[PDB]
Write a protein that binds this DNA or RNA. Structure first.
Lengths: 87, 601
RNA sequence: UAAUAGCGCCGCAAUUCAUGCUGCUUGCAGCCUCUGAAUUUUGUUAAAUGAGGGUUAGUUUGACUGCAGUCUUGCUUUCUGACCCUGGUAGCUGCUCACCCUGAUGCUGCUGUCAAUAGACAGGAUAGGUGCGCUCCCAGCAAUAAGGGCGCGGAUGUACUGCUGUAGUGGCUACUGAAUCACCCCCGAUCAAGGGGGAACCCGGGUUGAAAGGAGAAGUCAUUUAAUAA
């Protein structure tokens, strides 16, 4: 999981305000940060079954948050997809 | 009659690495030739109807793949190994699918035929006695019986009077006076519905898969799933089912179906050596215990005897039949050809060891070859008849071999073996003309000094099943079971039963027609559980877990095979019969042997 | 302190016969000295089973020829013995927790010493409960079965381990510590390789624990853990 400094850094950049402790922008971005650190270890440690359970959960949460945001506000959804480099 | 023996093969790296590269490259056209049938072939459903693969189709898909830029680097015998394996994959899977189709139809009949006594009265517009009288007429006509009554319902609807033919069939081809409980009938008719449902589910099977070593689909899916967003729950789960899949680490084995495509020799150091057709640069050294060496010396003696005799003796009687070359998985780190272990598995027909046994195979093949030539009687077909007639002539010229008189047993003395859940075996030796049991054995006698091993097997199954549960919750790789102990116990009983058959000069060993006990129990416990937990499907599955699990762990097919193998190596005939539903394990064994004796005529 | 009960095994004791023991009537009479089946009983320095994790191309189960002489190979497994350990730091990574109640196929349970902090040190497979074990039971913990209660902030168009967080417990890779044995001791080789020196006993030769094998491919089933979903 992320360092304390790394969470504070991510929440301050994707949060709409410093007090925006849990917007979808924040949650999706944090998940994207974790997933980007976990694919670099899981491509090397191919025998590490316990980490594939962690990855498949963490990707599936990201998708639910994104589907919710898409219907809620397509402009927020489009910007968030850009800022995270997703397709 | 056949057995498999084995040795590890030793060579220097360059040879174990070159062979790996050919098998990692050969493993791939074993995948592509599956796909060329799995989805490419248009006739596929005609094969599923017939239950058999056409004898040339895999070769006709492989021949143009021999020049493929991906597959072209391999010897002519490695392509025949590919064609062999893919032929045997499909030739097995289609034959599984056909027996399932036949069972589903063969019970869809019976779910239509099975009616309550009140339904027969309504359907006939007549009395249940009129039905008993017509059932008595139908038995008088018939006297193949159960089949003849099934056929007489499939034919001969007879103004619905086939109602009485169903009355016979549900009563086990006999007349019955009693009138049945509709609750017992409801359980009975529900078991058939469950079997029908289960068969309509199992009717669809996963199209036989190739062993992909590349990880390419898995790596592509990983980078897709982590960098892109799925458009559907079905797509997000499609990536999950791929990412959870464990990939293979070993290529398919080479199969050498011609015994002469292995060449044997003796090394300067006195060790035995082998080489394969198309790999004749790569000499390998045999390493095996002296408990098995006598076959590997016999391989070289069979070969030298033919070569010393200007090919006038045939490999139609060579002790080696076919070889399967396989990489057994090693442990720890290293390149695959330094980590895994080349092992050569030789199929051997054990009755070729002796001269008296070789003469059986000479007569068996000479009769089969003679019939083949007379069934055949075109250009290459004449060349095939030249192969056959050179065999039919050469097979009469004998190898110098060990002599041992054949076993002979008394045609009236039989060993009955009774299998069950609590007693894996129990034995009665019957003199069938005296109607006299010569001896009985229970398990405590039937493996003697080893009787502690049954208690060990039950402790180990229970202990290890709990440890596997605890280990899975922690994602530990440690996953172990009693399978090799169960295999040893089934072999101890197989030796003791045949030693007992030899002791009393028995003419045969009798084994029960157990059939598919696992599916039968699964349907019976479900039809019952649905009456005790209606609507609560989780409670229905929990109803008798330990009984259903103990039936799925019951090794009856492996004990039946272990006895068959050891009996046929000794020369004792195997016979079969219905095992009684009631009586003690001894009475079951007694009546089983007497039933198999009564079935002689 | 506690663990009374339930369930599975292990013998011990009968009681009933036989697949057994004496006869000739080759099928009866007779009993339980053995060898075995069935029921019921038991927990007695009775007897018998008895899963903390690991270690040898180990020994014996082998082939051929008339029980004697030749040849012999180190494969895949099941036990019985014996010995060793109860681990080390260097990264990567999963899960779990605001705080409470219920407490799960949940974790933990040995001897001795110092602390009496939660942990070190030295012993060790006798290691919570019984003759021996369990998903059962007792004791402590319980966030990491599950359900319910519910505080402040973020979001609030259905998404929300999504906040209150530095520890707990796993997974994997690289290096490393001990045993690398089959009567002990010593020097080596692990796709190969053996050799040298002793103790004990039997009648200068042996002995110094036994046993099994028909192998591959593919589909399918049952339970059992994870993930997703309604």
């Amino acid at each position: 999981s992320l360092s304390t400094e790394a969470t504070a850094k991510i929440v301050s950049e994707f949060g709409r305000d410093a007090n925006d402790t849990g917007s979808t922008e924040v949650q999706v971005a944090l998940l994207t940060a974790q997933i980007n650190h976990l694919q670099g270890h899981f491509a090397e440690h191919k025998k590490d079954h316990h980490s594939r359970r962690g990855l498949l959960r963490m990707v599936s949460q990201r998708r639910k948050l994104l589907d919710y945001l898409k219907r809620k506000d397509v402009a927020r959804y489009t910007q968030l997809i850009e800022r995270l480099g997703l397709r | 009659s056949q057995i498999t023996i084995q040795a590890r093969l030793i060579s220097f790296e360059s040879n174990r690495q070159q062979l790996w590269k050919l098998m990692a490259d050969l493993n791939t056209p074993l995948i592509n030739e599956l796909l060329c049938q799995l989805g490419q072939h248009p006739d596929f459903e005609k094969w599923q109807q017939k239950g058999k693969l056409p004898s040339t189709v895999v070769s006709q898909l492989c021949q143009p793949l021999k020049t493929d830029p991906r597959f072209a680097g391999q010897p002519s015998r490695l392509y025949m190994s590919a064609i062999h394996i893919v032929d045997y994959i499909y030739k097995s899977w289609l034959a599984i699918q056909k027996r399932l189709q036949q069972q589903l139809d063969g019970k869809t009949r019976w779910l239509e035929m099975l009616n309550s006594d009140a339904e027969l009265v309504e359907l006939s517009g007549d009395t249940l006695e009129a039905i008993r009288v017509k059932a008595a007429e139908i038995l008088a006509i018939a006297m193949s019986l159960s089949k003849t009554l099934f056929d007489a319902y499939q034919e001969t609807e007879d103004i619905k009077s086939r109602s009485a033919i169903s009355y016979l069939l549900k009563n086990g081809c006999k007349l019955t006076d009693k009138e049945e409980d509709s609750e017992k009938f409801a359980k009975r008719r529900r078991q058939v519905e469950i079997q029908i449902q289960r068969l309509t589910e199992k009717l669809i099977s996963r199209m036989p898969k190739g062993r992909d070593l590349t990880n390419a689909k898995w790596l592509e899916t990983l980078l897709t799933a982590t960098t892109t967003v799925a458009e559907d729950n079905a797509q997000a789960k499609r990536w999950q089912d791929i990412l959870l899949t464990r990939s293979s680490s070993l290529p398919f084995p080479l199969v050498f179906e011609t015994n002469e495509d292995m060449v044997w020799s003796k090394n300067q150091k006195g060790r035995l050596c082998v080489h394969f057709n198309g790999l004749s640069d790569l000499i390998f050294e045999v390493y095996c215990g002296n408990r098995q060496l006598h076959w590997f010396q016999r391989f070289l003696e069979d070969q030298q005897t033919k070569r010393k005799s200007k090919n006038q003796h045939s490999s139609g009687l060579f002790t080696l039949r076919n070889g399967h070359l396989v990489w057994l998985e090693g442990e720890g780190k290293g390149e695959p050809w330094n980590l895994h272990h080349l092992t050569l598995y030789c199929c051997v027909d054990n009755r070729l060891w002796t001269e008296e046994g070789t003469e059986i195979v000479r007569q068996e093949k000479a009769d089969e070859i003679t019939k083949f030539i007379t069934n055949m009687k075109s250009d290459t077909q004449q060349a095939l008849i030249q192969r056959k007639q050179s065999t039919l002539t050469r097979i009469n010229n004998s190898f110098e071999r060990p002599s041992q008189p054949l076993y002979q047993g008394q045609s009236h003395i039989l060993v009955g073996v009774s299998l069950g859940l609590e007693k894996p075996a129990t034995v009665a030796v019957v003199d069938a003309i005296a109607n006299k049991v010569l001896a009985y054995r229970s398990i405590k006698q039937l493996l003697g000094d080893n009787y502690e091993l049954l208690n060990r097997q039950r402790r180990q199954q229970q202990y290890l099943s709990h440890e596997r549960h605890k280990a899975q919750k922690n994602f530990s790789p440690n996953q172990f079971g009693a399978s090799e102990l169960g295999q040893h116990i089934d072999r101890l009983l197989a030796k003791a039963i045949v030693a007992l058959a030899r002791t009393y000069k028995a003419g045969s060993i009798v084994l029960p027609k157990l059939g598919d006990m696992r599916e039968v129990v699964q349907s019976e416990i479900q039809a019952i559980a649905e009456q005790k937990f209606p609507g609560y499907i989780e409670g229905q599955q929990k109803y008798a877990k330990q009984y259903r699990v103990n039936v799925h762990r019951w090794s009856y097919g492996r004990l039946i095979q272990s006895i068959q193998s050891k009996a046929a190596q000794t020369g004792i005939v195997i016979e079969e019969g219905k095992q009684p539903i009631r009586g003690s394990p001894h009475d079951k064994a007694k009546e089983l042997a007497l039933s198999a004796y009564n079935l002689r005529l």
